[PDB]
Structures are given as C-alpha cells and as structure tokens.
Amino acid sequence: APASIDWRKKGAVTSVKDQGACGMCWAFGATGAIEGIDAITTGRLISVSEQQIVDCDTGGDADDAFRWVITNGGIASDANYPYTGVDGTCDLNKPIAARIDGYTNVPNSSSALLDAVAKQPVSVNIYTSSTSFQLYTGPGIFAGSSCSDDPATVDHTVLIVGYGSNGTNADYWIVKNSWGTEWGIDGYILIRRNTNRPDGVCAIDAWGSYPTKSTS
Amino acid sequence: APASIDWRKKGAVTSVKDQGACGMCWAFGATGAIEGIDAITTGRLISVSEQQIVDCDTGGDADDAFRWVITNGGIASDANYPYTGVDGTCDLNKPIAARIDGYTNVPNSSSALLDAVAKQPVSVNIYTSSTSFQLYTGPGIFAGSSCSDDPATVDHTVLIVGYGSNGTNADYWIVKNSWGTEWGIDGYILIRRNTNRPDGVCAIDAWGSYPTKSTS
Amino acid sequence: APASIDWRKKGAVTSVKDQGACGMCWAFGATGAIEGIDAITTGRLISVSEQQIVDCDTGGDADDAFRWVITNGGIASDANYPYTGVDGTCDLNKPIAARIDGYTNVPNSSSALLDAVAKQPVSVNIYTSSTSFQLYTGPGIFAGSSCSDDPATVDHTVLIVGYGSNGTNADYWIVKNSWGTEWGIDGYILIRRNTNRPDGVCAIDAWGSYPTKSTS
Ligand code: NA
Ligand code: NA
Ligand code: NA
Ligand code: NA
Ligand code: NA
Ligand code: NA
C-alpha cells in the first residue's frame, strides 16, 4: 500500500453530516463507504440516504446497512430522502442513487485495514463514550488514552477516509464522523495508528468492512 | 487568477438552451451557474430545470433562483422537469439533480469578477435591448458601442464561462446565452473586457453572483 | 485513429449484463452505446434500462432503440426500471438517467468502424447462431470459421468497446455481449478484425451505429 492516502483529495468523500441527538441514526459510517465506492466506480459523488436505511431496516452495524442496500437493489440520495434522525415510514418508491453487490470484512489486523483503506473508504466500529473523544477538537492526533479498546464495547460506526504519518510515534488514520463540522477537525478525527493497543485506539481495527460493486 | 480560463473545456458547461419567445423564463443564467458548481464538486455534468424555478418561484434575478433552490433543498433535472417557457403548475415531487448551500455576490469591480470566474461559472445581469446585441453573430469580440452600461437598466441574466485575451485592446469574457445556437457564436458571445466603461459593456460587471456548495 | 483503444479502461463501460433466456430483450447492445456516450459527455457511468425500451417500444435493432430514447426525451436507469426479460407494462413516469439527440450509421467498411470506435462504443449487429460462437470461452481471438457473414442473416446486437492487435493475423475487436460473465472472456469476445471476409466475422462490420448527444 502507499505511505499515505486521503480519499477527500481524490473525489470520493461527501460533506460531513450532522446527526444531532437522534432517535435512530445508526447507518452513518456505512453511508459514506457506499458513497466512496459509488464515486470510485461511477464518477459520481452523491450523498446517499442514511434515513432510508433506518426507516426500512429498523440499532445495526455497517454490514446490516450494506445487506439492506444490496437486498433493496440500491439506495436513494439524501436529497430525495432526507434525514430526520427519527424512525419513520419506509418509502421504497424513490429514485436509486447508488447500488452495490457485496461487502467484505477486514480481519482484526492493522495491516489488513491499511490495505483496505488504500483501496477505498472503509467503515469501522469504535468506542465513543469517553468524554475525551466527545470533546476532541484537534488540532493534532487523538491518542485516546481513556478510550476502551475492547472490541465488545464498540458503539458507533465511522468512516476511515485515509491514513499517513507525521513522523515516528505519529502514524494516523483520517476518520470522518457524522457529528457535524463543530466536532473534531471540521468533523474529522486523526486517530493514532501503529500503537501498542492490538485492537487499535477505541477498537478501530477490530470491525472494518466495506461495500463492493461489479464493474466492466 | 490565470491569464485565461474556459469552463467549457473543463467539463462544467452544459449544452446551449433555447428559450424561444417565452412567457416566463427568467432563470436561465442562474441555472448554468448551478450546473457549473454541481459539475465541479460532484463529477456530474447535468442540465437542471429552469422550468421548475419559474413554476415554483413566480421576473427575478439569479439570486432569486439561488435562494429558491436553497429553500427547496435542490433542483430537478431539465430531463425530469422539462422547459415550456410558460408558467405552469409547480411540481415539488420530482427527483433532485443538484443541491447548493449558499451564494456570493461579486462587487462591481472587473478584477473581482475575473477572480470569481477563475473559480467557477458566474451569473451576471446585462442590458440586451440594443439591436446590435440581438443580431450579434460573431465572429469576433462584441464591443457593444450602443449597449447601455447603466446598472439600473439591465434586463437579462447570462453566464460567464471564461475569459482570456487576443492582444492589447482585445481582452474578453466568454458568455453563454439561452437564445439557442442560432445566436452569437454557437450560442455564446465574446464580450469585450478591460474597457473604459466602469460598469462593463452592457453593465456586465455590475451584478455578478454565484452559488456555493458544502463539500468534504 | 489510434492503434488501439479500450473504453473499459476509460470509464465508459458498465458491468456485463445477463439476459437469460428472455422472452423479449432486443435492446442490449444499444443500451451500452447510450451508456458510453452518457459517460463520455456527462462524467457519469450508469447502467440504463434495457427493459424500459422493450416495454415501451415492442424485435428491433439498435437504431430502433436510439429512436425510442430520442422520442421519449431520455431513458431511465436499470436500477429504477429493472430487467425482467419479458415484455411488460410501459412505465414513462420514471426518472431520466441519460438523454441523447441523434444517431449515426457507420458504412460497411472496417476503416469507418475503427474510426467510430476510436470515438465511442459502437453498436453492431452480428450472426450468433453457430455453436462455436455460443460456446466461445476464449482465451484468445475468435476466428469464427463457421460464422455466417451475410449481412441479411444477423440476429443480435452487441457493443464494440475497443480494438487492437496482438501481431500480424491477430487484429481484433473487443466486444461486450449481454449473455453474462459465464460466456466468453468475462462476458466479452475478442473478434478477429482485418480478415478476408468483407462484411467481417459474423457480419460485424455491416451494421454499426452509435448515438450522439449535444454538448456545450
Ligand atoms: Na440488513
Ligand atoms: Na423518514
Ligand atoms: Na427566490
Ligand atoms: Na411546467
Ligand atoms: Na423506435
Ligand atoms: Na417491466
């Protein structure tokens, strides 16, 4: 894999979304992974409907979202099926913006996650209950010294959009959250990589997956 | 800014439209500016519905069009909501092709307009009542010696898609009209720039604006 | 024209489709040509609805498909109007994914077909009733020694997506079929070009055509 990548510079990442204090909004993180593969394969960078997955498939993880989009034969755009944050009536008669064919799980191994992110944006499940995570505003790498790294205690899907290094002891992941641009660094967090925590900071390397699509 | 730009060569300009002798068709000029920012930011070059703005928001200027598209949460494609030239029933249940978030006014200063066109296609309001403008067919730069340059007497929105220079006394703007390809140079006019008329030929530099969009 | 081209490497070819044992499915081959010009001109690589042409226009050749899409003012996506293989109720109230303006017939001359494929994917009509064609799995060039080359006996539209040469006596066309990826070389056939058969192997050079679109 390359020494660094940033899918935001490669036209595969949509704007940061703000879920608010939602009643049911578990599919962000998966939605950006669909957006990434749709952009790479079809030349189209379009936000997809996190709300349609929630309304038509309800908690859940990224693979539950991928499975629903595959079963439905696609997903509507966020513009045609907007976000409310609360579970409402499922509408299936909406235009399709993106379609995927499968999904792949990444093993709990930092090297395998790096390889996957070199290919496309990857959804991951992380622990987010520490106040230090909640209050992260940058400007630098998040060390997560109070994060729980137990894979069993993760609670939130986010999207890895890249990685790189600022020097020894400063390898990182670039992670898109859905908490709006008044969180992190314009809505992103730079999470330390290549630490002595085998499951990764906040268990980031335990639960990676990404959607796949048939092409010519 | 660069010495020249032509957004038609950069994949940000759709075909020239023909408004005919319309009853109500004031939103061309604004529509191409939306198309430009949608292409630049999403990788998609799609004509948008000038008719939907007219039906759902009726005269008006480009900012009235931008304001309506922002308020509606987007605009349909011209293919899904075709042009008739006459005000008809507003249809809001149509797929969304483009969405924008804001708009910016350019000061009445040629340098600020040049900077804006180096960034994206820009809508401008011009005076168009001189027979010389009506009968322009090229093949060269339009000098507009009979044009009125009073900002108060402009009457039509068009779209600046580029600029350049053919030598001293031959600086120009590249302007897309909506009068079909049997006007101008395949529907465009090359309007002299950097003259001694402070508001510009036909007041072109008085009323520039352009739509903006949130990105990753 | 260049010595070789492969539109699959240039972002203009969608996944291979599988028509199955259809009751009515004559528009594949034309559909990929629309997809090609839509990708080249609009930056969008999207499968279009072969089923909508069949439902709304029924046999036929590629020009019948082009004529229907022009008359309808566009064609829906395959995602919004899925394939069944059997003629059913025509639905015209579906979002438009692609629009074209005209079509051009290629003369029965290999050089003119090469020039057309250097410009975009081209639909062609071929004879497909020989068991050797049916059972082609590669891995090399199809010589078609049992193919009928009579233009009057062609029976199926396919799509030329490129051409090249592997040496003297090994010039070829790259042809996308709609028989799924368990036919040919992942759904494609490499048909010998520049033979002593004037109408081409399986009459491939007799009936080329392609759709055209107005642009800026
Ligand atoms: Na599911
Ligand atoms: Na809802
Ligand atoms: Na308005
Ligand atoms: Na109307
Ligand atoms: Na027809
Ligand atoms: Na049908």
Give φ, ψ of A113 to 5 degrees.
-65, -40
SS3 A209: strand
B152 CA: distance to closest CA in chain C (Å): 31
Which residues, 6 or more positions from B138, have their beta carbon under 8 angstroms from its beta carbon? Answer: B184, B185, B189, B190
User: Would the CB atoms of A15 and B215 count as touching at under 8 Å?
Assistant: yes
C-alpha span between A42 and A98 (Å, rounded): 9
Residue C29: left if φ>0, alpha if ψ -120 to 50, beta else—which one?
left
C-alpha span between C128 and C134 (Å, rounded): 7
Give φ, ψ of C46 to 5 degrees.
-140, 130
Which residues, 6 or more positions from C60, have their beta carbon under 8 angstroms from its beta carbon? Answer: C26, C27
Which amino acid is located at A157 in the chain?
A: T
Which residues, 6 or more positions from C185, have their beta carbon under 8 angstroms from its beta carbon? Answer: C137, C138, C139
Strand B188-192 vs strand B171-176: parallel, antiparallel, or unpaired?
antiparallel
Characterize C16-36 residue by residue with b for buried, 16 or more Cβ atoms within 10 angstroms of its Cβ, and e for exposed: bbbbeebebbbbbbbbbbbbb
Torsion of CA A31, A36, A42, A46, to 10 degrees: 50
Tokens of B136: 């322009």
Which amino acid is located at C170 in the chain?
A: A
Tell me if C39 sits within 8 A of A43, measured CB to CB: yes
C-alpha span between B209 and B63 (Å, rounded): 7
Distance of CA B196 to the CA centre of its chain: 23
Question: How far does the centroid of ligand 4 lie from the alpha carbon of residue B65, in Å?
Answer: 16
C-alpha span between B175 and B185 (Å, rounded): 10
Tell me if A39 sits within 8 A of A159, measured CB to CB: no
Closest CA to A85 of A128, A134, A26, A14: A26
Q: Which CATH superfamily is domain B1-216 in?
A: Cysteine proteinases (3.90.70.10)
Active site residue C156: yes
Q: Which chains touch C (3 or more CB pairs under 8 A)?
A: A, B
Residue A135 burial (10 A CB sphere; 0-12, 13-18, 19+): exposed
Query: DSSP code of B17?
Result: P
C-alpha span between A170 and B74 (Å, rounded): 42
Domain spans of chain A, in order of start: 1-216
- Identify the helix (H) or strand (E) that includes residue B130: none
Query: DSSP code of A201?
Result: G
SS3 A65: helix
Report how far apart, in Å, the C-alpha atoms of A12 and of each of A78, A119, A161, B42, C22 are. Answer: 16, 11, 9, 9, 37
User: Before B198, cis peptide (omega within 30)?
Assistant: no
C-alpha span between C151 and C135 (Å, rounded): 22
Q: Which residues of B touch C44 (CB under 8 A)?
A: 43-46
Tell me if C17 sits within 8 A of C50, measured CB to CB: yes
- The separation between the first and the last C-alpha atoms of chain C, rounded to the nearest angstrom, is 24
SS3 B119: helix
**What is A122-148 written as a DSSP string?**
EEEEE---SHHHHT---SS-B--TT--
C-alpha span between B81 and B48 (Å, rounded): 8
Closest CA to B173 of B128, B137, B108, B121: B121
SS3 B163: strand
Q: Which residues of C touch B8 (CB under 8 A)?
A: 216
Report how far apart, in Å, the C-alpha atoms of A132 and of each of A123, A135, A136, A207 are. Answer: 22, 5, 6, 22
SS3 A62: helix
Q: Which residues of C touch A74 (CB under 8 A)?
A: 79
The β-bridge partners of A103 are: A211
- The separation between the first and the last C-alpha atoms of chain A, rounded to the nearest angstrom, is 24
Convert chain C into a string of H (helix), E (strand) and C (coil). Answer: CCCCEEHHHHCCCCCCCECCCCCCCCCCCHHHHHHHHHHHHHCCCCCECHHHHHHHCCCCCHHHHHHHHHHHCCECECCCCCCCCCCCCCCCCCCCCECCCEEEECCCCHHHHHHHHHHCCEEEEECCCCHHHHCCCCCCCECCCCCCCCHHHCCEEEEEEEEEECCCCCEEEEEECCECCCCCECCEEEEECCCCCCCCHHHCCCCCEEEECCCC
Residue C171: left if φ>0, alpha if ψ -120 to 50, beta else—which one?
beta
C-alpha span between A155 and A152 (Å, rounded): 9
Residue C91 burial (10 A CB sphere; 0-12, 13-18, 19+): middle
**Which residue in C56, C125, C147, C156 is the catalytic one?**
C156
Tell me if A34 sits within 8 A of A64, measured CB to CB: no
* CA-based torsion, B137, B143, B147, B153: positive or negative: positive
C-alpha span between B128 and B175 (Å, rounded): 13
SS3 A16: coil
Which amino acid is located at A81 in the chain?
A: Y
Tokens of B191: 């309007």
Residue B137 burial (CB count, 10 A) = 9
Give φ, ψ of B29 to 5 degrees.
95, -50
Rg over CA atoms, chain C: 16
Helix C30-42 and helix C62-72: axis angle, to 10°?
50
Active site residue C25: yes
Tokens of A153: 């205690």
Closest CA to B211 of B97, B63, B76, B28: B63
Give φ, ψ of A202 to 5 degrees.
60, 25
Report how far apart, in Å, the C-alpha atoms of C196 and of each of C111, C168, C169, C190, C192 are. Answer: 14, 13, 11, 17, 11
Report how far apart, in Å, the C-alpha atoms of A96 and of each of A45, A49, A116, A157, C92 are. Answer: 14, 10, 26, 23, 16
Query: DSSP code of B206?
Result: S
Which amino acid is located at C204 in the chain?
A: I
Convert B76-103 into a string of H (helix), E (strand) and C (coil). Answer: CECCCCCCCCCCCCCCCCCCCCECCCEE
Distance of CA C170 to the CA centre of its chain: 22
Residue B133 burial (CB count, 10 A) = 22
Residue A169 burial (10 A CB sphere; 0-12, 13-18, 19+): exposed
Torsion of CA C153, C154, C155, C160, to 10 degrees: 170
- Identify the helix (H) or strand (E) that includes residue B116: helix B110-119
Residue C2 burial (10 A CB sphere; 0-12, 13-18, 19+): exposed
Closest CA to B127 of B199, B27, B24, B44: B199
Residue B70 burial (CB count, 10 A) = 17
Tell me if B205 sits within 8 A of B199, measured CB to CB: yes
Q: Where are the alpha helices (DSSP H) in A11-109?
A: 30-42, 50-56, 62-72
The ligand that comes nearest to the alpha carbon of residue A86 is 2
Tell me if C63 sits within 8 A of C209, measured CB to CB: yes
Residue with tokens 């990708």: C39
Q: Which residues of B are catalytic?
A: 25, 156, 177
SS3 A211: strand
Give φ, ψ of B132 to 5 degrees.
-60, -40
Tell me if C69 sits within 8 A of C75, measured CB to CB: yes
Tell me if B30 sits within 8 A of B65, measured CB to CB: yes
Question: How far does the centroid of ligand 6 lie from the alpha carbon of residue B92, in Å?
Answer: 26
Residue C5 has, within 13 A of its CA and on its CB side, a CA count of 20
Question: How far does the centroid of ligand 4 lie from the alpha carbon of residue B155, in Å?
Answer: 23
Out of A46, A82, A161, the one facing B42 most closely (by C-beta) is A46
Q: Which residues of C touch A42 (CB under 8 A)?
A: 44-46
Residue B161 has, within 13 A of its CA and on its CB side, a CA count of 29
**Which residue in C56, C125, C147, C177 is the catalytic one?**
C177
Which residues, 6 or more positions from B179, have their beta carbon under 8 angstroms from its beta carbon? Answer: B18, B19, B187
Quoted resolution (Å): 1.3
Closest CA to B122 of B91, B71, B157: B157
Tell me if C4 sits within 8 A of C163, measured CB to CB: yes
Residue with tokens 């609009």: C42
- Identify the helix (H) or strand (E) that includes residue B198: none
C-alpha span between B24 and B54 (Å, rounded): 7
Closest CA to B50 of B73, B27, B71: B27
Report how far apart, in Å, the C-alpha atoms of B106 and of each of A128, A194, B113, B124 are. Answer: 44, 48, 6, 9
Question: How far does the centroid of ligand 2 lie from the alpha carbon of residue A24, in Å?
Answer: 11
Tokens of A59: 């908690």
Closest CA to C50 of C71, C21, C29: C29
Tell me if C24 sits within 8 A of C86, measured CB to CB: yes
